[PDB]
């Protein structure tokens, strides 16, 4: 998992306010896809699926969270459209009907 | 009317008391000065009570017993009884 | 001058004020007008006097023989209201009465919900509207 704190990009820096920002999500996703292609071609070469040329990876983008870092993330997928082909965009975002207590904030 | 201030008159208008001490006490602000308070004694049903009252009176040649009357309020908190004459 | 405002209300602000040519209702209006001038009455009081004045027995049920929704025609009202200001000596120059009473109505014709009024602001009361927003006022 390539993470905004895993890639540098986070600490000892500008601030927390901008930590979960759009452009960080973009940096992370675009850094991840770059490293994702070759390993995909290797995992396929292992079972004998060459995917030599003129092929796209059929992708399902599952998105969680309703936070700023989402927007930018998907953008870094869209500029890879010549490599990756998105069939389905479905977001899995947990909804709390009720459940165990969340951590107590300041006021309540 | 405040009926609990009269506790030591015991249903009487005036009292007879004996002099013991005379000390001074400072009134509630914004009134400054020294209020003279006489500490007196009297007996009822063979009980000896110490009464504490405001000395407004005129002392002449040395004398012992006073006549106590109740008033309205005064500068000094806690002192209900006043002095009429000294005998 | 507030007189013209009052008369505008009696003309346009009242559904079915009977037949306003008849000497009875006409005299009601005349007297009340002369009582708004010379300050003998509040405008509000004279208006509530006008609309509560005695007209004719079973008034509504005679009104069902003329009107559908109880809104009469406004010509009799304006002709009477000009007539009263002329016969009373209200203005030095005769025409001014009619002109002003007419003009103030024509300007209000363009306004949203023109012939209804909030009861508090309609007449003299403790709290008032600013002179621009007053209703039949010259400053609108």
């Amino acid at each position: 998992t390539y993470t905004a704190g895993n890639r540098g990009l986070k600490g000892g820096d500008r601030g927390f306010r901008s930590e979960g920002s759009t452009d960080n999500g973009h940096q992370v996703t675009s850094m991840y896809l770059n490293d994702l292609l070759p390993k995909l071609r290797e995992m396929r070469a292992s079972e004998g699926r060459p995917m030599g040329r003129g092929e796209k990876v059929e992708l399902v983008v599952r998105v969680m969270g309703f936070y700023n870092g989402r927007q930018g993330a998907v953008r870094a997928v869209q500029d890879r459209a010549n490599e990756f082909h998105v069939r389905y965009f479905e977001d899995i975002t947990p909804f709390p009907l009720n459940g165990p207590k969340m951590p107590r904030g300041v006021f309540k | 009317l405040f009926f609990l201030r009269m506790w030591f008159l015991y249903g009487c208008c005036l009292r007879f008391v004996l002099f013991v001490l005379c000390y001074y006490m400072s009134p509630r602000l914004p009134s400054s000065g020294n209020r003279r308070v006489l500490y007196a004694v009297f007996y009822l049903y063979n009980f000896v009570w110490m009464l504490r009252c405001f000395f407004c009176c005129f002392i002449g040649l040395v004398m012992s017993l006073f006549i106590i009357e109740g008033g309205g309020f005064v500068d000094l908190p806690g002192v209900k009884y006043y002095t009429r004459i000294v005998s | 001058d507030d007189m013209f405002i009052w008369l505008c209300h009696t003309a346009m602000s009242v559904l079915n004020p009977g037949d306003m040519r008849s000497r009875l209702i006409y005299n009601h209006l005349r007297i009340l007008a002369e009582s708004v001038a010379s300050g003998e009455m509040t405008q509000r009081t004279a208006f509530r006097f006008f609309e509560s004045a005695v007209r004719s027995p079973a008034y509504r049920e005679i009104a069902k023989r003329q009107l559908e929704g109880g809104a009469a025609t406004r010509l009799a009202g304006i002709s009477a209201a000009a007539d009263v200001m002329r016969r009373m000596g209200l203005t030095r120059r005769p025409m001014s009465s009619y002109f002003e009473l007419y003009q103030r109505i024509v300007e209000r014709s363009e306004a949203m919900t023109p012939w209804g009024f909030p009861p508090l602001f309609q007449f003299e009361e403790r709290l008032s509207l600013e002179p621009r927003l007053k209703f039949f006022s010259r400053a609108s």
């Binding site: - | - | 306004a111 209804g116 909030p118 602001f121 403790r126 709290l127 509207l129």
Partner: protein, 196 residues
Amino acid sequence: RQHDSGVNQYGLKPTNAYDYINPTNLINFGRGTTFDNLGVRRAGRGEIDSSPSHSGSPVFTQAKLIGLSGEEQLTMCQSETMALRLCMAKAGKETCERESRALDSCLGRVGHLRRAMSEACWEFNDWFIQNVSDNHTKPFQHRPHDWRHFYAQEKLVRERQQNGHAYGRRPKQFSFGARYVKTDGYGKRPRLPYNK
């Protein structure tokens, strides 16, 4: 006479007994105050205390209504700007000023449209002040405590169900999984408060 009946020579004319003990109330309602401005408690426009009120809470969103200057604001031309953007992004060999002409036409109209909407909205402010606004004279309806009586009516009901006993009482919150962590003999779901 020459001015309002609710305002005499020295200020607002003091009717209730509150005015005679507190006659600062007659001459000062705030920093938007002038002398002609007494008895008309709302002050001019664009001015301090000029805002009209609706059931007591002032109307500060007017532009947001007609969709001038809001985040939700109405947009006149979209198809044009998108069309032109598409043109710019596609290729550089052919340049289309046809699109930029349709667009600048669109804008040229938009100006007058907007001035019209603004004017109509100021007329709305005037009308709203005349025929609707109470001039900050009635109690707020917009926060839950103002509706306390309503909630009371509901508490009362849950009390009469409980044999007219526990007012304002609610069921004890149990646990995330109270039902399946408890043994036979203990209450596994939260009961009515009277039932405890």
